Amino acid sequence: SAREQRDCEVIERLIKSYFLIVRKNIQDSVPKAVMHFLVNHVKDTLQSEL
Amino acid sequence: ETSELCGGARICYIFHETFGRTLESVDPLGGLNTIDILTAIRNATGPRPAL
Amino acid sequence: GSSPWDRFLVGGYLSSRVLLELLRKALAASVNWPAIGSLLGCLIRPSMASEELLL
Amino acid sequence: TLQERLLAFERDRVTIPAAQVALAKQLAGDIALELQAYFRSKFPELPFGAFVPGGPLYDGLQAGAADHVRLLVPLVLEPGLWSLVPGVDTVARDPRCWAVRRTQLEFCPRGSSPWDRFLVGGYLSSRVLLELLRKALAASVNWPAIGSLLGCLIRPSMASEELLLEVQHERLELTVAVLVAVPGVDADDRLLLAWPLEGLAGNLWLQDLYPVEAARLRALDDHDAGTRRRLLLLLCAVCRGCSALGQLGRGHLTQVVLRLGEDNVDWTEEALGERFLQALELLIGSLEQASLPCHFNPSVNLFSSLREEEIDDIGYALYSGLQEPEGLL
């Protein structure tokens, strides 16, 4: 099929576009989680821990 | 002491030069074999007919 | 049982019949003709007689 | 004509501005020197030699940023404790790859050499070496200091062991292919490259015959003041300016030109057009056979990684190149 291949190409474009949106968000999301749950946490906890 | 990047901005490096770039290398068209996708959408239809 | 062709062994002879039955079944349904048609850009399917295919 | 077009084509498409070339060579040395200093402090236990810049940038004319800066990192193995083995001789039977065997353990047991940190079974691990050194480049190296020092943006690639000059202040961008390899021979040519084999044993190595091939074409030209390398340089630019030839790299062209080089024809600039078409004919024929045996190792088919149909299509594209020579230029 050819028409369906063209429809598949549309799907591929939708996949790429949405994926990149998701990935872009992840690029900021993770760092923040690490800072929040690990870095900033122990930054304050350690004193009481020690 | 001036030396290898560490402690602070090294993590900034991790969150950009390492991590950000790492993600930039991922896909976005990876795995997308047109023909396999055509199979996948046939599977997505399933036992029924489709418009 | 030592040869793979012994699955077609009836009495002491190789069964062309059973071979045909399995291979025609493979073409009849097992083969993913939707993948073949999608790949080659065409409509290809199995015939309804002997062991033939139709474009 | 083709002859005239090739001459212009060299000037217009082969030549990569001398300013960029000189800057690239400067940075090649600067990066090497920084990494030398870094490895001295990062891996003081290992006997790393002085790193050597090379490749097209030096090997030919003004290549500049057209291809990678090759950077040798010398794995000075302790003579007598390590030995070269063919991959085919082992269970992982791949003659194209090589193994470095640890020996003399009855006099120098594992833990005595610094290279024994890479000792798996009884062989030197190219894989672990790559993992650590790529990690060093990936993060350990202070690329902010390098960029600040040299006045540029330099960082590590996201594949193999390469570096990227994102931009030197003087309008220059380029990439560096870091070749971590055992010095190898006293000819300063053949190296044992820390190869990144994914299959079989990833500890295996690659016999680097690049400078051997380059020296051979140089020697062949020096034998009769010929222009074999000039043809190669033209072909390189043709591939750069032709997406159909994106599957045929410098290595592919090198094998063809080595075959061409081993001949006695008009090797002067006046017959660039003639030999250009001859190069096309030889390459196309190889493509029609879907087979390009390496000049220094005929068991290596350089077209074996390419689709037969695409291989033929490349030959057809080049065939139209024969029909309209200047259309490749």
UniProtKB/Swiss-Prot annotation, chain B:
Ubiquitously expressed with highest levels found in skeletal muscles, heart, kidney and brain. Isoform 1 is brain-specific. Isoform 2 and isoform 3 are predominantly expressed in testis and skeletal muscles respectively. Isoform 4 is weakly expressed in brain, heart and kidney. Isoform 5 is dominantly expressed in liver, heart and kidney. Isoform 6 is expressed in neurons. Changing G7D: In EMPF1; uncertain significance; unable to associate with MIEF2 into filaments forming the tubular structures that wrap around the scission site; presence of concentric cristae and/or increased dense granules in some mitochondria. It is found in: Cytoplasm, Cytosol; Golgi apparatus; Endomembrane system; Mitochondrion outer membrane. Coiled coil: none annotated. Changing G7S: In EMPF1; the mutation acts in a dominant-negative manner; defects observed in mitochondrial fission; significant decrease in mitochondrial respiratory chain complex IV activity. Phosphorylation/dephosphorylation events on two sites near the GED domain regulate mitochondrial fission. Dephosphorylated on this site by PPP3CA which promotes mitochondrial fission. Dephosphorylated by PGAM5. Changing C6A: No effect on S-nitrosylation. Functions in mitochondrial and peroxisomal division. Mediates membrane fission through oligomerization into membrane-associated tubular structures that wrap around the scission site to constrict and sever the mitochondrial membrane through a GTP hydrolysis-dependent mechanism. The specific recruitment at scission sites is mediated by membrane receptors like MFF, MIEF1 and MIEF2 for mitochondrial membranes. The GED domain folds back to interact, in cis, with the GTP-binding domain and middle domain, and interacts, in trans, with the GED domains of other DNM1L molecules, and is thus critical for activating GTPase activity and for DNM1L dimerization. Homotetramer; dimerizes through the N-terminal GTP-middle region of one molecule binding to the GED domain of another DNM1L molecule. Oligomerizes in a GTP-dependent manner to form membrane-associated tubules with a spiral pattern. Interacts with GSK3B and MARCHF5. Interacts (via the GTPase and B domains) with UBE2I; the interaction promotes sumoylation of DNM1L, mainly in its B domain. Interacts with PPP3CA; the interaction dephosphorylates DNM1L and regulates its transition to mitochondria. It is linked to May be associated with Alzheimer disease through amyloid-beta-induced increased S-nitrosylation of DNM1L, which triggers, directly or indirectly, excessive mitochondrial fission, synaptic loss and neuronal damage. This is Dynamin-1-like protein.
From Swiss-Prot, chain D:
Residues 1-329 are cytoplasmic. Expressed in all tissues tested with highest expression in heart and skeletal muscle. Coiled coil: none annotated. It comes from the Eukaryota. It is found in: Mitochondrion outer membrane. GO terms for biological process: mitochondrion organization; positive regulation of mitochondrial fission; positive regulation of protein targeting to membrane; regulation of mitochondrion organization. It is a single-pass membrane protein. Keywords: Disease variant, Membrane, Mitochondrion, Mitochondrion outer membrane, Phosphoprotein, Primary mitochondrial disease, Transmembrane, Transmembrane helix. One of its GO terms (cellular component) is mitochondrion. Interacts with DNM1L. Mitochondrial outer membrane protein involved in the regulation of mitochondrial organization. It is required for mitochondrial fission and promotes the recruitment and association of the fission mediator dynamin-related protein 1 (DNM1L) to the mitochondrial surface independently of the mitochondrial fission FIS1 and MFF proteins. Regulates DNM1L GTPase activity. It is linked to Combined oxidative phosphorylation deficiency 49: An autosomal recessive, mitochondrial myopathy characterized by progressive muscle weakness, intermittent muscle pain, exercise intolerance, elevated serum creatine kinase, and deficiencies of multiple respiratory chain enzymes. Does not bind ADP or other nucleotides, in contrast to MIEF1. Belongs to the MID49/MID51 family. This is Mitochondrial dynamics protein MID49. The lineage of its organism: Eukaryota, Metazoa, Chordata, Craniata, Vertebrata.
